[PDB]
Amino acid sequence: SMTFGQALESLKRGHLVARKGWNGKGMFIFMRPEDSLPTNMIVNQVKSLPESFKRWVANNHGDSETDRIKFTAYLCMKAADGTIVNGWLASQTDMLANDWVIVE
Numbered sequence: 001s002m003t004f005g006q007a008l009e010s011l012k013r014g015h016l017v018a019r020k021g022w023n024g025k026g027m028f029i030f031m032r033p034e035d036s037l038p039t040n041m042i043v044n045q046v047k048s049l050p051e052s053f054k055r056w057v058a059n060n061h062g063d064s065e066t067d068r069i070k071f072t073a074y075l076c077m078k079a080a081d082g083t084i085v086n087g088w089l090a091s092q093t094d095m096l097a098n099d100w101v102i103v104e
């Protein structure tokens with residue numbers, strides 16, 4: 001048996017984990033790391049953000065002032081169809097289950 005709590009501690013240590021009880025097959029979850037980025041980079045360089053958010057950052061930072069924004073750690077899933085889902089969330093079942101397994 002393995003709890004979500006134990007799976008989370010394995011995730012925090014960099015492992016890939018999954019539930020035997022999921023409907024989809026061949027899936028797993030993993031943690032993406034925290035990073036703190038300079039505001040100028042966010043505004044002028046990061047491709048993976050909408051323009052309205054780059055605008056909010058620019059208007060609160062000016063591409064100046066030694067400024068940084070922390071992007072917190074989060075969970076992701078390699079889904080059944082091979083896509084990567086940023087921001088995996090745990091169902092009630094996932095949270096309370098004890099069929100978790102280390103995938104790698």
Ligand SMILES: Nc1nc2c(ncn2[C@@H]2O[C@@H]3COP(=O)(O)O[C@H]4[C@@H](O)[C@H](n5cnc6c(=O)[nH]c(N)nc65)O[C@@H]4COP(=O)(O)O[C@H]3[C@H]2O)c(=O)[nH]1
Binds near residue numbers: 034035036037045049
């Ligand atoms: N749509 C999409 N594209 C993705 C994804 N993962 C990687 N990429 C693409 O791969 C590029 C390189 O990512 P990186 O080496 O992690 O280099 C990243 C990383 O070092 C940092 N960064 C940006 N956003 C985050 C974030 O939310 N968390 C962390 N930890 N770092 C971030 O800024 C660098 C530059 O980011 P970009 O200019 O956007 O450049 C990104 C982006 O074009 C994803 O989940 N979705």
Ligand SMILES: Nc1ncnc2c1ncn2[C@@H]1O[C@@H]2COP(=O)(O)OP(=O)(O)OC[C@H]3O[C@@H](O[C@H]2[C@H]1O)[C@H](O)[C@@H]3O
Binds near residue numbers: 021022023077085089
């Ligand atoms: N392509 C995906 N994109 C995002 N997230 C995914 C995908 N695929 C799986 N997940 C996550 O794994 C859990 C179990 O996987 P699953 O058993 O295969 O889910 P499902 O049969 O497709 O049903 C769907 C319901 O499952 C619950 O948890 C899901 C999701 O959090 C949710 O509330 C769903 O509304």
